[PDB]
């Protein structure tokens, strides 16, 4: 039992796709330099720590996806599989049945130069609620003012206000591996 109110997912027509997506070049570690979405909330009192997401291409060309976060003095690892979708740069979630209440999952790479930065859009339906987020990925933990403002502009263009747009604080634990 619950009640909740969410900013609606934008139509997919407002979400560009990186042209000529190169899956081999997108591999490796990305830091989450910026975070936005309808279930993302700024918390000034206990700000979000930076985490990292590693993309490894398997032999079948799906990604093994591992996220690592520092929490409760430990490194927590989350693993999922991204299965190539309708066009290059889009993915759906492998083994969706193993996740209760999850009926829909989409990933679209919005833009990337592969060696410094990226913006990725995620949309899912979980317990019948439609969630979305955008990640600003960094090859390093810091990015230019220009790339952060572009990320803000894009997030706002999808209906998100500033208090749904977070810039996680760089840390050293867990994510420098
Ligand atoms: C626990 C707690 C705090 C936490 O540490 N969350 C992290 C875990 C580490 C990966 C980053 N991330 O998105 C988190 O949620 O999170 C939660 O209880 C719930 C419910 C949890 C349900 C399952 N879930 O949301 C997952 O994300 C499951 C596995 C994550 C690995 C997949 C690859 C991640 C790539 C995307 C990325 O780079 O961020 N999820 C969330 O709060 C966040 C906020 O919005 C979303 C979300 C929204 C739309 C689409 C995808 C989403 O993950 N998840
Ligand atoms: Fe999540």
3-class SS of residue 155: helix
Find, among 74, 48, 56, the residue nearest to 136 by Cα. Answer: 48
What gap in Å lies between CA 143 and CA 119, rounded to an integer?
12
Number of CB atoms found within 10 A of residue 17's CB: 15
Contacts of 2 (CB under 8 A, 6+ apart): none
- Number of residues that make up the chain: 177
Please list, in sequence order, all residues whose beta carbon lies within 8 angstroms of the beta carbon of residue 164, skipping any fewer than 6 positions away: 7, 36, 37, 38, 40, 41, 42, 155
Give, using CA atoms, the residue closest to atom 12 of ligand 1: 67
Residues in the chain followed by a break, C to N above 2.5 angstroms: none
In the reported structure, the alpha carbon of residue 67 is separated from the centroid of ligand 1 by a whole-number distance in angstroms of 9
Which residue spans within the chain are E strands per DSSP? 28-37, 52-57, 63-71, 74-84, 90-93, 102-112, 117-126, 129-138, 165-166
Compute the C-alpha angle 116/123/91, nearest 5°.
Answer: 65
The residue segments making up the domain with residue 25 are: 1-177
Helix (H) or strand (E) holding 154: helix 145-157
Per the annotation, does 52 bind a ligand?
A: yes
Distances (CA, A) of 132 to 64, 71, 106: 21, 23, 9
Contact yes or no for 51/35 (Cβ under 8 A): no
**Main-chain dihedrals φ then ψ at residue 79, nearest 5 degrees:** -115, 135
Cβ burial, residue 173 (10 Å; 0-12/13-18/19+): middle
The answer to whether 31 is annotated as binding is no
Backbone angles phi, psi at 86, to 5 degrees: -70, -30
**Resolution, expressed in angstroms to one decimal:** 2.3
Question: Cα(155)–Cα(151) distance, rounded to whole angstroms?
Answer: 6
- The number of the ligand 1 atom at minimal distance from the alpha carbon of 126 is 22
Residue with tokens 């009640």: 3
Query: What's the token pair of residue 14?
Result: 């407002």
Alpha carbon distances (Å) from 156 to 38, 49, 107, 137: 11, 22, 19, 17
**CATH code, 92:** 2.40.128.20
Residue 6: nearest ligand to its CA? 1
**Domain count for the chain:** 1
């Amino acid at each position: 039992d619950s009640t909740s109110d969410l900013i609606p997912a934008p139509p997919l027509s407002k979400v560009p796709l990186q042209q000529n997506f190169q899956d081999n070049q997108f591999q490796g570690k990305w830091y989450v330099v910026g975070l936005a979405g309808n279930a993302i909330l700024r918390e000034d009192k206990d700000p979000q720590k930076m985490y990292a997401t590693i993309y490894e291409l398997k032999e079948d060309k799906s990604y093994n996806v591992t996220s690592v976060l520092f929490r409760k003095k430990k490194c927590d690892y989350w693993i999922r599989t991204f299965v190539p979708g309708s066009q290059p740069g889009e993915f759906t979630l492998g083994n969706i049945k193993s996740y209760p209440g999850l009926t829909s999952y989409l990933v679209r790479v919005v833009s990337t130069n592969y060696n410094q930065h990226a913006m990725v859009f995620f949309k899912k339906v979980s317990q019948n609620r439609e969630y979305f987020k955008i990640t600003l990925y960094g090859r390093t933990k810091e990015l230019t003012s220009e790339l952060k403002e572009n990320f803000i502009r894009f997030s706002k263009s999808l209906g998100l206000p500033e208090n749904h747009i977070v810039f996680p604080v760089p840390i050293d634990q867990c994510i420098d591996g």
